[PDB]
Amino acid sequence: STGSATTTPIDSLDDAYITPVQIGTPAQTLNLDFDTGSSDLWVFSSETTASEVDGQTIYTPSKSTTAKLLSGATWSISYGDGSSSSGDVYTDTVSVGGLTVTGQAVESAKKVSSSFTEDSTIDGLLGLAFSTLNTVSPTQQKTFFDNAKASLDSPVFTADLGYHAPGTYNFGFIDTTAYTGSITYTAVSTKQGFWEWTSTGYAVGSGTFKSTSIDGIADTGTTLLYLPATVVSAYWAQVSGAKSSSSVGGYVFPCSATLPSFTFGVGSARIVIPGDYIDFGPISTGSSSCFGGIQSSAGIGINIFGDVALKAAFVVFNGATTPTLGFASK
């Protein structure tokens, strides 16, 4: 089997991407944030504290003839941005882009933190990291991909995120029309539960490539590119007036700037992030200070190849017995 679904930016800055997902019978379609940095599929629901729902579409398990309470199971997750959610668990039928999994754990939120409530466009998350990170207790549950894998034509999914435009998540096949040149594959460590790999270095603009190993994660659920402070400083030093602002929480730059590109290495191959991908717009409405899309990972404890990086590439998440990642230009 295969599936193919369009993923759409939630706003004009590509702050996140939503993909429609069918849950239950009859189908309830929710727009979920596909997150290769976590491993829980959770949704706003009829069980979510009412004051914490503000415009989201909810899953109502009592209206699904295939929903079953997973007795005694609870979940609770906290993300790197400080947001969190928790609740109980149903199993139900979940389909993405024509690919159907029966008995998928659908984690129903009883509580969500303020940033979730405040974002009306995201109805929940669909985790695509390794199932070892799944938070369901006392019986850990599998991701949608893990459940689907054996049925797929090939045990892969691909992320093809757009810049200020829709893109595609495919399951079970590689669309050879969706990228240019060849796909370069690189090793993955699953030790921390992530799609963790080692970039071979970077360049800033038209500058020379610096060969250096950068361990990080391919994370569709993180908006920006988080790299070591040395790398980030080298990038922003090429933008007149750019500075790290403790009050804003990262590097900012004059909105009048033309940003240089940023290149990262995948083996001997190179992925070029155009400068415009690195502009996250005014820090507050009407400001001429703009937020940067490349930020320091110092104090995160891990480098994160988030959407800023991934949207410059066609990315293969290869879930073969020994997982790997593939990157192509597009």
UniProtKB/Swiss-Prot annotation:
List of catalytic residues: 35, 199
S-S bonds: 255-290
Enzyme type, top EC level: hydrolase
Peptidase A1 domain mapped to chain residues: 17-328
Keyword Nucleotide-binding: no
Keywords: Aspartyl protease, Disulfide bond, Hydrolase, Protease, Signal, Zymogen
One GO-annotated biological process of the protein: proteolysis
EC number: 3.4.23.22
Catalytic activity: Hydrolysis of proteins with specificity similar to that of pepsin A, prefers hydrophobic residues at P1 and P1', but does not cleave 14-Ala-|-Leu-15 in the B chain of insulin or Z-Glu-Tyr. Clots milk
Keyword Nucleotidyltransferase tagged: no
One of the record's GO molecular function terms: aspartic-type endopeptidase activity
Family of the protein in this entry: Belongs to the peptidase A1 family.
Name the record gives this protein: Endothiapepsin
Organism: Cryphonectria parasitica (Chestnut blight fungus)
Full-protein positions shown: 90 to 419 of 419
